[PDB]
């Protein structure tokens, strides 16, 4: 603002050099905590995916994902976190949003932000660049959403199977295993796989650095733990690429672990805790992913206790939270970024927060303190956000 | 030669133009610019002027010019004062509170002291006989001290007089000069001469300064009169740039329990935490002086913020 149009001109009195800097300090703190701790919710989940997409694409936001037009989309049923529970990684790619749409019927609220978004407008026409995938089978997104996006007039890719393991070999295909590393869930882990999507769908160059314009994501597999070994389609696609387990033993068993290792050539990492909770937090804790004391940003969403279904809300938020800090934007015909990327991690929590989930953010929390912190949706009790804000010194 | 910026309030106005007439009545300043929305609009140049009543006037266009403009400022709108002063006593014109002051320490000065009695020095009068004196003679018991004005110019001076012969003999019969050491038992008109004060010649102006070396020497039972001597030298030509916004203008006492906590201050408008940081930063180093974000003034620390928005 200019002066001649700041609202009011505060003077600051004090005798001695301490008591003067103890105020700055307080200022600082409650100025940062009241600005930039957000909640980005709406009335239900199909509208909490479309308030993050009008908020962080195509938008003037002071954080956003994306100023200028998005290309790609990817649409997830809202009922149906086992087909698109890979679909994350891509959405981050792709430079899309991940939106959510009801399996019979496209929303209209979802018909409207998908124009708006990708920049569809009567005076102008849908180019051969305009793609909306679909994750998921027909009982995921039934064949009425598909053709009424056809009618539309732009293209439609169906990534599905004939069940959640083949769906998610399809889109993790499509994400394409470029930096010879891939993460691997149990049928059973759907907290498990949320816990990582953050982290998965970072973009990196092939020298493991933060990179949004040319890096690429990290495809995640889900396999049946249940079994003695790993099928042909799976062991095919993982070829000699570094493997990350996210889940237990009773997840995915060491069984598995050791059909991976000889398959790949290349002994398994896993990363688990005892429960849900246990397990998001021992993710923030492992240094490959959020170094210690280097965290700014932080997400809270809820982790399904109640209802699975309601992972949904961290599914849509995942790709934001992995390109948070910097914008996606161009300068003529040159795709270029602006600020620094600053990824975040998704902490799960509906009721009550976990003992380890408080030294997971006071550990990859930096000595300066949390800049910014989202609420995802509605739902979650203040008691943990008012935990997680003294965590973060806010 | 200093160039400042200041940043002023509307409801304040009257206040900071009432600054500049006192300062070009000083004739100290040399030209006012004056500019509406950082446009320049009138200029007013003091070069010729050398008499308190041709800058009086002038002086009152400064208000008149400004006047329903500053009343009736928007939000959104500025005003801009840029003042060219010179500082320095040769080349301004002492107030009369900066006189009053200099009369009042002037009155006050000691101008002989009270001595052992082991030496020439000042003796009191006791039943008869001289004794170690009581307490130092001042200034204020010879002379007295005058503000007028000039018939020349109109500038405020100072002048000084000898005291009455009345209540300059009432000192003469209790205080007095000893030539020689005093063994008390002394008869007081036989062992003490009573002091002479000189006649005053000189008036401090302009271009004069008090002399506190000359100024009441003591040669034996002589006293010297006020002296003045060429004053000290200032600098020509600084900018003095005073905006004027249509800004609520708050004060917070930090070392007091009524006061704005942070908190409540935070909620209310919004603050740039890259001058807040520059402000802390600043406050970690030495005593937190040196740097343009703190300052002192009038013996406490004074820092100025300017919210973005509420």
């Not at chain 1, 996006?149 to 070999?169: F, H, I, N, P, Q």
């Not at chain 1, 869930?185 to 907290?191: E, K």
């Not at chain 1, 996606?328 to 270029?336: A, E, F, L, P, W």
């Not at chain 2, 002492?94 to 020095?121: P, R």
């Given at each position: ?21 103890d ?10 905590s ?10 239900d ?13 195509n938008?003037?936001?002071d ?13 997830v ?12 990684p ?16 496209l ?74 590393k891939?993460?691997?869930?149990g ?17 990196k ?11 690429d ?13 790993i ?10 690429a ?37 397990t ?23 982790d ?12 849509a938020a ?34 009550t ?27 979650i009790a ?12 806010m | 030669?200093?160039?400042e ?5 509307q ?13 070009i ?21 003091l ?6 009543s ?31 002063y ?7 014109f ?10 009042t320490?002037?009155?006050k ?12 020095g ?43 012969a ?15 050491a ?106 937190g ?17 300017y919210?973005?928005?509420?």
């Amino acid at each position: 603002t200019d002066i001649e149009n700041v609202p009011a001109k505060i003077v600051l009195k004090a005798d001695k050099q301490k008591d003067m800097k103890d105020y700055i300090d307080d200022l600082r703190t409650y100025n940062n905590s009241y600005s930039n701790v957000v909640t980005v919710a709406g009335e239900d989940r199909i509208e909490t995916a479309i308030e993050l997409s009008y908020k962080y694409y195509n938008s003037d936001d002071d954080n956003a994902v994306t100023d200028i037009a998005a290309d790609n989309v990817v649409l997830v049923g809202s009922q149906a976190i086992v087909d698109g529970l890979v679909a994350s990684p891509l959405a981050s790619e792709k430079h899309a949003p991940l939106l959510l749409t009801s399996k019979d019927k496209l929303d209209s609220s979802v018909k409207s932000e998908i124009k708006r978004v990708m920049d569809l407008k009567t005076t102008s026409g849908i180019n051969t660049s305009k793609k909306v995938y679909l994750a998921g089978g027909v009982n995921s997104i039934s064949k009425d959403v598909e053709n009424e996006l056809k009618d539309m007039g732009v293209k439609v890719v169906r990534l599905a199977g004939d069940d959640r393991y083949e769906t998610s070999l399809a889109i993790a295909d499509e994400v394409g295993l470029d930096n010879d590393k891939a993460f691997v869930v149990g049928g059973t882990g759907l907290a498990d796989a949320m816990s990582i999507a953050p982290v998965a769908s970072q973009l990196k160059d092939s020298n493991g650095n933060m990179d949004v314009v040319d890096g690429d994501a990290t495809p995640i597999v889900v396999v049946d733990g249940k079994a003695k070994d790993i099928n042909a389609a799976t062991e095919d696609f993982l070829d000699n690429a570094q493997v990350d387990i996210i889940g237990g033993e009773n997840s995915v068993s060491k069984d598995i672990e050791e059909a991976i290792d000889d398959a790949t050539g290349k002994e398994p990492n896993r990363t688990s805790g005892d429960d849900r909770q246990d397990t998001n937090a021992e993710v923030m804790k492992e240094t490959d992913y959020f170094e210690k004391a280097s965290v700014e940003n932080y997400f809270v969403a809820k982790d399904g206790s109640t209802k699975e279904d309601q992972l949904v809300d961290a599914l849509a938020a995942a790709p934001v939270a992995a390109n948070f800090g910097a914008t996606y934007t161009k300068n003529g015909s040159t795709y270029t970024k602006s600020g620094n990327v600053s990824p975040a991690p998704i902490v799960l929590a509906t009721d009550t927060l976990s003992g380890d989930q408080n030294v997971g953010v006071s550990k990859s929390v930096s000595d300066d303190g949390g800049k910014n912190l989202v609420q995802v949706g509605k739902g979650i009790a203040s008691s943990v956000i008012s935990k997680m804000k003294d965590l973060l010194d806010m | 030669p200093v160039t400042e910026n200041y940043v002023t309030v509307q409801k304040d106005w009257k206040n900071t133009v009432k600054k500049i007439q006192e300062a070009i009545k000083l004739k100290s300043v040399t030209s006012v610019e004056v500019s509406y929305n950082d446009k320049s609009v009138s200029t007013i140049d003091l070069s010729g002027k050398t008499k308190v009543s041709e800058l009086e006037a002038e002086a009152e266009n400064l208000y008149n010019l400004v006047d329903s403009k500053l009343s009736n400022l928007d939000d959104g709108d500025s005003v801009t004062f840029k003042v060219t002063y010179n500082t320095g006593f040769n080349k301004r014109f002492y107030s009369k509170s900066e006189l009053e002051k200099i009369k009042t320490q002037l009155e006050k000065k000691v101008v002989v002291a009270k001595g052992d009695g082991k030496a020439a020095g000042l003796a009191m009068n006791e039943n008869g006989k001289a004794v170690v004196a009581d307490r130092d003679l001042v200034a204020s018991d010879f002379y007295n001290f005058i503000i007028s004005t000039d018939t020349s110019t109109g500038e405020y001076i100072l002048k000084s007089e000898k005291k009455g012969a009345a209540s300059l003999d009432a000192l003469n019969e209790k205080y007095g000069y000893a030539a020689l050491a005093i063994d008390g038992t002394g008869d007081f008109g036989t062992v003490t001469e009573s002091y002479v004060p000189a006649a005053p010649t000189d008036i401090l102006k302009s271009t004069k300064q008090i002399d506190e070396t000359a100024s009441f020497e003591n040669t034996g039972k002589d006293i010297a009169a006020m002296t003045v001597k060429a004053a000290d030298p200032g600098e020509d030509g600084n900018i003095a740039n005073i905006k004027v916004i249509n800004a609520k203008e708050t004060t917070i006492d930090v070392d007091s329990k009524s006061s704005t906590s942070a908190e409540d201050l935070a909620k209310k408008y919004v603050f740039d935490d890259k001058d807040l940081k520059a402000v802390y930063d600043q406050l970690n180093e030495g005593d937190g002086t040196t740097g343009k974000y703190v300052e002192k003034v009038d013996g406490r620390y004074q820092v100025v913020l300017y919210p973005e928005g509420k």
